[PDB]
Structure formats: C-alpha cells, structure tokens
Amino acid sequence: LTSTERLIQLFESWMLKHNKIYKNIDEKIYRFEIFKDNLKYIDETNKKNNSYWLGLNVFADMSNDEFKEKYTGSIAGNYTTTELSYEEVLNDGDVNIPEYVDWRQKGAVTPVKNQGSCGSAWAFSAVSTIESIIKIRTGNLNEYSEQELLDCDRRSYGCNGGYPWSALQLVAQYGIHYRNTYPYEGVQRYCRSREKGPYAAKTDGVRQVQPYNEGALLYSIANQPVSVVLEAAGKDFQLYRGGIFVGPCGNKVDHAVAAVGYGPNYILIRNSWGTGWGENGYIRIKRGTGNSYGVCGLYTSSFYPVKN
C-alpha cells in the first residue's frame, strides 16, 4: 500500500497471525518505525531475475537491528574448530545414486519450534540429530528433550552463545528425555539428565561428514537427516522467505540445525525459527556449485547419527 494512511490496519492484520504483544505504549510503537520500509527491503530485491528472492514477514522489525544477535546469537566466541578427523570416516566410494529424496512427504520431521527471548538454537540440531534417526531401522517414534543438552552440557553456554560440538557428542553417557516430558521455559539452572525420568537418549558414534566437502555429504542428506552448520547473515536472509539461494551471504558459519532436504537445484531443510522465515521450517541452497566454502558455510562438515 503506497497510501501512508492505509498502512495502519496491518499492525492490526499482521500481528494477529504470529503473536500480538509489544513493549508498551511508547516503546513498542517503535517496532513500527524500522519495519516501515518492509517492502523497500525486497520490492526489487525480488525484482531480482536472480535465483533467490525470499518474501516478507516473520518480523521486519527483525533484520539488521539488534535482532541479529537474537538469531545468530549462539556459538561465536572462540573458534568452533572441527573434524574428530578419524572415526568420523570412510567406507563409501563413487555415487551411482539419485541426488534426490525428501522428508517433506514421508513425514519424518516433528513440528520444530520458536522458543523465546534467548536462542540456544545451537541446541535445536541435536534434538534433531536424533529427531528422525529413530525410523532408520526401528520405526520408533516420538521426540527426546530440549533444554537438556542445553542444561546438562556445562561444556558451554547456549544463550548469548552456544557450542555445537558437545550437545550430540556427549549424548551416550548421560542420555535425554522427551520433548513433551520436558518442554522448556527460557533457561535451566537445575539441569537434570540423571534426574529427568531416566535413560532415553544414548548415541553410538557420531559420524562427521568430510569437512570442507560438497561431496560425500549426500549420504547425510539422504541416508540420514544432515545437520551441518551455516551463516546466520543477520541481515537480508534474516527475513528469508522461500526460494533457492545464492544470496549475498558470507560463508563464515553461524547457526547449526537440521539439514533434511537435497535435490536437483532445490534441497529442503529444518529451521526452528518459526512459521515464516526459511519458509515454515526449511530452506534450500543452490546445489551443484564450484566453491567449497562458497556461501553460508554449509558443506563445511556435519556430525550426524548412525545406528551402531
């Protein structure tokens, strides 16, 4: 709507769908001042005859603003160095396989989630490292827990910052409850793995996919629910909606979630942000490229589950 006055019913119409709250009388209204140019940020960004477009609303109050610290928020700090090097590897050669399969038709994924004021997000992935590995040979259902491996993993913080290495790698000697049995509020001072019911989540030998490799990772795209790590470009992709990407990005990884989705020049995923960005809960980076590092630090190695 190009008419200044006719933009008001949105605040009304918009907020109804994905939350109605605010700061208060004076301060909140400010949410409306840096979302005023919602369409400016896209209008043509879309006009891009390009390979990526992405639509508006999940929060345009959210993008460049302090919000980028919301999303990205985790990890950071010191290097999140990788590859256990040995053990995480080989017994697979050429391909002689289809580059395509999905989990958007089988139904292997549980409704991901939009938590709260702190994104320990880095911990969502783990809850996934197993979320679907369950059917691989057992057909077992249900989900384990969130807050745990976010509360028992002292190894580091998950709020203001969270480590991607120890939520899945410390999974065999303690174990973890279910999603229902232990939903979370906002942090968990009293972390109880030996105290939350009993033993439920026991690993086997987290199989790290060849680092800096856009090759063998396809077994982890189809023979398991891939869970790499990418760049949380707290900006333009921070309002990402649909399409395939080539971006505007910046390879230096930021967030590590579920990577369930690979095909021709498509490839889904799992994005626990919510019901609007990275469409409903997924994405798709432009496959078949030429640069390892490329953009959005994807194919720079995983650490997924296999049943020993």
Swiss-Prot record:
Keywords: Allergen, Disulfide bond, Hydrolase, Protease, Signal, Thiol protease, Zymogen. Its EC number is 3.4.22.2. GO terms for biological process: proteolysis. E64 binds at residue 121. Optimum temperature is 50 degrees Celsius. Unstable upon 65 degrees Celsius. Leupeptin binds at residue 121. Residues 1-96 form a propeptide. The keyword RNA-binding does not apply. This is Papain. It comes from Carica papaya (Papaya).
